């Protein structure tokens, strides 16, 4: 993975 709800270490940012 998420953006704000939970940022992923490797990669994410799919939804806030």
XYZ file of N, CA and C in Angstrom, unseen atoms left out:
47
model
C 2.032 -3.051 -0.990
C 1.171 -1.811 -1.130
N 0.827 -1.201 0.000
C 0.000 0.000 0.000
C 0.865 1.256 0.000
N 0.217 2.414 0.070
C 0.927 3.688 0.079
C 0.979 4.271 1.489
N -0.154 4.787 1.952
C -0.238 5.377 3.282
C -0.599 4.321 4.323
N -1.599 3.505 4.009
C -2.042 2.453 4.917
C -0.867 1.593 5.369
N 0.081 1.372 4.464
C 1.258 0.567 4.770
C 2.190 0.486 3.565
N 3.288 1.232 3.624
C 4.262 1.245 2.539
C 5.099 -0.030 2.538
N 5.259 -0.626 1.361
C 6.037 -1.852 1.224
C 7.526 -1.542 1.116
N 8.344 -2.356 1.777
C 9.790 -2.168 1.755
C 10.324 -2.226 0.327
N 10.157 -3.376 -0.315
C 10.623 -3.563 -1.685
C 9.872 -2.645 -2.645
N 8.579 -2.904 -2.813
C 7.748 -2.100 -3.701
C 6.269 -2.278 -3.379
N 5.478 -1.247 -3.663
C 4.052 -1.310 -3.397
C 3.319 -0.072 -3.874
N 2.784 0.697 -2.931
C 2.050 1.913 -3.263
C 0.961 1.627 -4.293
N 0.096 0.669 -3.980
C -0.991 0.298 -4.878
C -2.272 1.044 -4.519
N -2.445 1.326 -3.232
C -3.628 2.035 -2.756
C -3.370 2.672 -1.395
N -3.965 3.884 -1.173
C -3.776 4.565 0.095
C -4.822 4.097 1.078
